[PDB]
Every structure is written in structure tokens, then in C-alpha cells.
Amino acid sequence: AENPIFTDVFTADPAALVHKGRVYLYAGRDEAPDNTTFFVMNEWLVYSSDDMANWEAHGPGLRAKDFTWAKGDAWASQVIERNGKFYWYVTVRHDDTKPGFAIGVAVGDSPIGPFKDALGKALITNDMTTDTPIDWDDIDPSVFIDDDGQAYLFWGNTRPRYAKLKKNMVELDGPIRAIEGLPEFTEAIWVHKYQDNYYLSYAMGFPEKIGYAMGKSIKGPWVYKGILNEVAGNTPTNHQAIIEFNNKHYFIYHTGAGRPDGGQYRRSVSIDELFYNPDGTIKRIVMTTEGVAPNKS
Numbered sequence: 612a613e614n615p616i617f618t619d620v621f622t623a624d625p626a627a628l629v630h631k632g633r634v635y636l637y638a639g640r641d642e643a644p645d646n647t648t649f650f651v652m653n654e655w656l657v658y659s660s661d662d663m664a665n666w667e668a669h670g671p672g673l674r675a676k677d678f679t680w681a682k683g684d685a686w687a688s689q690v691i692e693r694n695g696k697f698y699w700y701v702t703v704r705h706d707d708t709k710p711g712f713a714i715g716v717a718v719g720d721s722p723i724g725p726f727k728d729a730l731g732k733a734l735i736t737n738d739m740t741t742d743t744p745i746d747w748d749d750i751d752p753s754v755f756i757d758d759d760g761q762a763y764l765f766w767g768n769t770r771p772r773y774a775k776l777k778k779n780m781v782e783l784d785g786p787i788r789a790i791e792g793l794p795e796f797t798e799a800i801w802v803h804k805y806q807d808n809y810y811l812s813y814a815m816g817f818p819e820k821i822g823y824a825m826g827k828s829i830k831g832p833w834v835y836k837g838i839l840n841e842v843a844g845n846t847p848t849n850h851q852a853i854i855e856f857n858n859k860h861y862f863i864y865h866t867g868a869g870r871p872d873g874g875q876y877r878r879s880v881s882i883d884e885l886f887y888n889p890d891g892t893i894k895r896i897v898m899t900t901e902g903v904a905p906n907k908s
């Protein structure tokens with residue numbers, strides 16, 4: 612499965628999920644004419660695989676403009692299943708009623724949708740977080756359900772943060788907490804659990820690499836552990852998903868390696884295998900051209 616995996620579109624900010632034997636893969640879609648101005652993103656695209664290698668294209672799943680309160684900009688996202696429903700947390704640009712980037716939540720009854728705004732309003736709004744003056748801090752959501760039934764929302768650019776999510780998945784429960792322990796944090800938090808440990812991987816520095824920290828609890832304390840991913844080919848933004856599928860571990864990300872004239876604002880999803888050490892640490896990723904081998908049940 613030669614990387615990059617999709618060649619008919621540029622494709623970025625991957626998020627993935629396993630359901631009923633299939634991997635569902637979610638990505639934003641880079642529509643920019645060149646690598647020299649800025650992101651131009653309007654819609655998220657959905658893909659699914661049997662085996663990690665052959666991908667079925669289900670087309671657009673959600674456009675940013677599907678949020679009445681949103682101006683545009685369909686930035687990084689993450690989907691989760693809970694109670695026969697699917698929650699899609701998005702980064703969009705709020706309209707001038709609450710200036711600045713915001714986090715919204717959509718809902719569907721199946722992995723491919725149809726998806727609709729679950730709230731009719733932002734879940735996180737720029738003015739809720741004012742310990743930084745920048746107006747793109749509230750981006751890149753990540754979502755997690757711990758073994759005790761408690762769900763959590765993580766996000767941030769420049770300022771990493773989390774909060775408890777109510778069962779209904781569309782409401783914060785309790786206060787927003789600043790996360791300590793993530794040297795050089797930039798963005799792209801991805802939380803997951805493996806065996807007895809918790810893992811918070813993130814984009815780090817600039818141009819971005821991915822670093823990660825481990826915790827004995829979802830509330831940490833987090834212990835930075837080293838570099839998970841080198842800086843990716845022809846792109847300053849590095850953006851991960853980590854999933855477990857069929858006894859192998861998958862590290863999904865993007866590169867500027869596509870054609871034609873791929874790069875900074877014309878990115879492409881690539882996939883490579885992740886391996887754990889016996890102590891629980893993750894081997895540094897090796898980003899490869901040939902990508903991943905099939906692996907179906």
C-alpha cells in the first residue's frame with residue numbers, strides 16, 4: 612500500500628476509529644492552489660478499510676459550513692462512537708459573534724453519517740480560554756472514554772487543555788484544566804490507552820515533530836518520554852492518529868509528499884506501523900514509501 616494512500620485529492624489531519632471489524636478514517640481536504648498562501652479547507656472526507664490497505668471512498672462526510680454559527684475552515688477533527696451514535700468534534704472558524712477558532716460537535720447514527728450539528732452552537736468558544744492572546748488556540752480536539760465510563764475532551768494549540776465530557780457527549784462537565792508535562796507543546800493532542808498506560812502524543816516545536824508522554828491515569832501526571840515522529844516530508848505540520856487493529860498498531864499521519872506540487876497546504880495522508888517496547892515506550896516511527904501490508908480478519 613504505497614504511501615500516500617489517496618491520490619485523487621489532497622488530504623490532511625487524519626483521525627481514525629474501529630467499528631464492527633472495519634477501520635473508519637477521517638480527514639480534512641486541502642483545496643489550496645499552492646503551497647505559498649494558506650490552508651483552504653471546506654469539507655471532511657470519510658474512508659473505510661477491511662485490512663488497512665484497500666480503502667473505500669465514502670466521499671464528504673461533513674462540510675464546515677454545515678455549522679450555522681461557523682464562518683468556514685474545516686480544520687482538525689476526531690470521531691468517536693458512544694451508545695450506537697457517532698460524535699464528530701471539529702475545529703472550525705467561528706462567525707464574528709464569538710471571534711476566533713472554535714470547537715464544534717456533529718452527530719451521526721452510523722460511521723459514515725449522515726452528520727448534523729449536535730448543538731446548534733460551539734462546544735468550545737475562543738472567549739472561554741483567555742490565558743493566551745492568540746485567536747487560534749482552541750483547535751485540534753481529541754476525545755477519549757476511560758474504563759470508568761467518564762469521557763474527556765482534550766484540545767489546544769500553544770495551550771494544551773482537557774475537560775470532562777458528560778455521557779451525552781455534547782456538554783462539558785466541570786472545569787477546564789491546563790495540562791502540565793508536555794515540553795514544547797504545539798498542537799495535535801492524541802490520547803489513547805495501551806495495556807495499563809495512558810498516552811498523550813502531540814505536535815511539538817516548529818516545524819512540528821510528534822512527541823509523547825505517558826501516564827498511569829488519564830489525569831496524568833504526564834511524563835514526557837521522547838520523540839514519536841520525526842518531522843514529516845515537505846510539511847511543517849505533523850498530525851497523528853494512533854489505532855489498534857487486528858493485533859498490529861497503526862500510526863496515521865500526513866506529509867507534503869503528494870503530487871502535483873504537494874506540500875505545506877496540499878498535504879496527503881500516509882500510514883505506517885507502530886511498535887511498543889516491552890516497558891510500554893513506543894519505538895520511534897519510521898516513515899516509509901511502501902507503507903503498510905494488508906491485515907484483515
Ligand SMILES: [Ca+2]
Binds near residue numbers: 745746748
Ligand atoms: Ca482562546
